[PDB]
Write a protein that binds this DNA or RNA. Sequence first.
RNA 1: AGCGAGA
Lengths: 174, 104, 49, 49, 58, 49, 73, 98, 82, 228, 225
Amino acid sequence: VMKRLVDLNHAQNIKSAKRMVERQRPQVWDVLEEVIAEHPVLLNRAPTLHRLGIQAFEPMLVEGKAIQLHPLVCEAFNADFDGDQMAVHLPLSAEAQAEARILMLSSNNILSPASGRPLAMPRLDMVTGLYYLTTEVPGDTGEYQPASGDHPETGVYSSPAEAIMAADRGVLSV
Amino acid sequence: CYGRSMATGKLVDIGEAVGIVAAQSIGEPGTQLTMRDITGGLPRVQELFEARVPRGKAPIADVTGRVRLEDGERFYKITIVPDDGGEEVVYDKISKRQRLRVFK
Amino acid sequence: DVVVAEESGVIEEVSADYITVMHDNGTRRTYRMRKFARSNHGTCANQCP
Amino acid sequence: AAYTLQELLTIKSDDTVGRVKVYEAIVKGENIPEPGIPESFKVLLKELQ
Amino acid sequence: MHKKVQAAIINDLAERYPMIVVAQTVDKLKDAGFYWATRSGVTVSMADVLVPPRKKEI
Amino acid sequence: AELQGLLSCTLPNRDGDVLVDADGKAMLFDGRSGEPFPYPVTVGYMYIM
Amino acid sequence: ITKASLATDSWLSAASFQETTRVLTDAAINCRSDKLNGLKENVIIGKLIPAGTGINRYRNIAVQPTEEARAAA
Amino acid sequence: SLKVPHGESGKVIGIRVFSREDEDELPAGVNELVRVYVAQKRKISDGDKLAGRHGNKGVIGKILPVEDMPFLADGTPVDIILNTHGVPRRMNIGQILE
Amino acid sequence: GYDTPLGITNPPIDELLDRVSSKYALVIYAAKRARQINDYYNQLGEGILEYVGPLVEPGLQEKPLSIALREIHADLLEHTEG
Amino acid sequence: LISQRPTLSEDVLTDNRSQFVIEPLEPGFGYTLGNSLRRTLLSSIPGAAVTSIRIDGVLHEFTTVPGVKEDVTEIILNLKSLVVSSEEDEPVTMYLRKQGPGEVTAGDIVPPAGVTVHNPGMHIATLNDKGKLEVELVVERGRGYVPAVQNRASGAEIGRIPVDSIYSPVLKVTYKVDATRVEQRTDFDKLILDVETKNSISPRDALASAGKTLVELFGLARELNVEA
Amino acid sequence: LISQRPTLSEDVLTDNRSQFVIEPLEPGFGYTLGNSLRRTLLSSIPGAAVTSIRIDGVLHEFTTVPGVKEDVTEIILNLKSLVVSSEEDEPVTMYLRKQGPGEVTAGDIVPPAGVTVHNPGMHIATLNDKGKLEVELVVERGRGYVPAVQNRASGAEIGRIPVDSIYSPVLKVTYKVDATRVEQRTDFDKLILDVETKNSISPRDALASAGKTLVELFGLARELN
RNA sequence: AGCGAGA
Ligand SMILES: [Mg+2]
Ligand SMILES: [Zn+2]
């Protein structure tokens, strides 16, 4: 950020820029957003029981003092949110940045190196939500009924969009 | 010969350190590897990879032959007449309390 | 951590810093509070009547 | 991942000559130099000697 | 969608489709899962914990 | 059993309405969407720290 | 496993492993020379591991544009 | 000079100047020992650790505006929302009873 | 389908692996290219030197390694393995 | 006075599909305005759709119409997703008819004045073996989605069977917000709407109408004390 | 077809609480409209609160005034429950002098022209024979919640003690709907919006301000036309 | 060097 804000002429020279940053002058936040972009970072959680204990993410700024982790990688770290402390490392060299961006990227490591079962799989909350969504409850509202002689089946719908629009009304249960 | 990389989902590369991956994969289920004398837990794993003679060393068949188990408390004697061969071997001190592993 | 009256009596005058209580026999006693004293672990040791 | 490991253990941690060099490269925008020998290996050498 | 079936789906998806698609699908799945778990109406209360009526006889 | 019995008699807050049923769960409105949640939700007072 | 590890041809790794005094004494008496071929050793002395991106086929790849790219210039 | 260590800030509650010049019982060698008391009023935010009395601990994922909070039929917004999935398998339904 | 990636995941890696033999090869390939272009930018002030690039119209504020990756995606580079 | 001016841009994906993007908004107004726009786009824009229909030779049996391949249900479905615009409030009637084998399409139906069909080249039904089909549509205009109204009269129209009515033009609106400029702007929110609508009206004009109706709707609240 | 827009009829229950019936509304719309209003009333209602005070014999908020029974921190907490309404954007100052025994309540403040205190009986502090509490407060217009500015933010010197401020009078907003949902589909929604404010402004004014705020953004949406 | 504590 010093380099960028000297390049941007927000500070005359390096030491003036260092003073600029040490007091967190207001102008040094926008440049910060500029620099952090497209710079991978490794997140370790001790102990690193296995290879997936350290993964590279693309960092993003957040307000307050807390590394906002992605839930789906929680299992990979075995890191559960009640006071775990996750260390952050910053690759520098071009080789290191390539390595972090390519080999270590969290989205590039889904399957376990041990048994290959997916490790970014939904679990706990997400799995319950999906189980509730995709399960079938006979006798629910808006069910299908093939009765004839008085009216049509009244269970079919033209398109899924129609189905959602009906569910918005208190007619069709999901 | 190694086979497919389990993580990448395709064949292995020509620089992968499969040794470290192997070892870490063996060790990772530690702790969650619980137990319920011959060991059967993490100590048992350690023994297997340590080549340590197990506590409950059950005798094993050596040469095909009719068996002439004799009755010795903590010291079962076990004779086996070799089908072709030399001389039947008796095992002076074998534990009686064990239970003979089933055969054909 | 809590101030307890040693002997009975009627509160003569109480302020944020101290409590002076008149005992049943002539004598009066003043408990001085401890205001915003630092505790051993950096917490506050405030007392208020 | 080998280069990042070498980077970590050499110029992020120990190498007393590379360290100022990587700082200079970052400040001025040049390519990160080649890592040297970590300064702990030499203390080991001297102690074994 | 038992967790088992989800695992099978993701395994097949990763085997067939390129990894990036797997990441995008997994992320969409997480989003939908959280939303519908919120709507799922799973809460714990003493009344929801039903003791078995035959306990004393056993 | 005493908890159930007490939870049954939970005299109304300000007007005539008992926000929590016998089970101990109430109907909660979603702040974001606005629609009420489809099922009642356990609600109460917890002492946390 | 322990014996197999301690029977390697690299005293700097065996010493890093366990029972330092004995292994160094033995290697010293034998005038043993470590060729620095494993991974622990390359870590210790801080040069590039011979694995993954460090082996001698990837470590020294030659990269250049194409003659068509030079023509684009 | 004594400077505020990195990551600290607040009000200067008290300063004590125990000096050899004032004939204070300073340890041999120091001529003037000064202690400055800095106090800060810490408010709740993401990362802080809360917990009830039944082992139901947790850090604060988020602090929503009061408007987008589940609010009862009477319009009283809830203050906290714990996760159901933690109750059964942690086997501490005392909280629920509480 | 892979609706367009947004950040560090652009271009998709699985597409890139077609251009090379192994992931490690891609890592080294991109890293050396990025080093080359970074030096090109550094030495642009002084007289022109052997280093060249970029071959793709860079983003205004875009790091050398992502430029290199964008080059790699379009088969604008060649390499020889040791 | 607001320190930041919201700006509404739009990315166009297909002929009728688009990503509307309004940034920045006082925190948190993304939801405040987004849930409203979604619901209004879905359930405020007037339109017309087939309300009931009858088929000659179809009196009590609703399984299969004779002389056609597609059974009753399928033709019900295809009529249901028949985009039409109307001007007269009262329920007009339309007559489709085709004799002989072939492929009956929407473009074959003859509409009276005041009602138009926006997809003549849509496949409706199939005829074979010199078969003949006649269909009468009772169609009016309305808003939202009205489920199949059970006929109040018992014997007044035995042939006229009710069908669910998709009056609204906008098909699917889905919204999400993001959290731009956490630091410089103190985390202002931006709304991304995704709008999918039939070819009856373009997504942009549909939003213009939605915004207009919301204006007029909250004009009720503003009317009380305008000088607020 | 509805062909009938809604209307908003008010009824008043008490001085600071009221209800508003909006009818007729399109089916399944009242919840959205009520939630929108509620969220407006809960976020963006321009208010006014004490933004910084100053006691004569105090330098910071972590001390005690002699004679006063409450710490300065307890006094700031008591003031923070104050409700006031101002008429000018510029910061205004209002004084509070009390001496001798007695209860210092909100009725003892001398508000200058425009600004007023609506809850005179609020207990600020209590005194004794030796206590002398003189405090000048600063009231400023704004919206929402803002953390206390710092002493280094402005030129105020030492004596200034910034305080957190809550610029909003809306105490409680809820809504309920009773949709007809008849089998003949002549449906409509009646929305009952109950609004309670802290006596600073009648609910009528709060609802009007919310309507103004909303129609601004939706008029932007219309201006897309 | 010694204490206590979090995961
Ligand atoms: Mg934990
Ligand atoms: Zn082989």
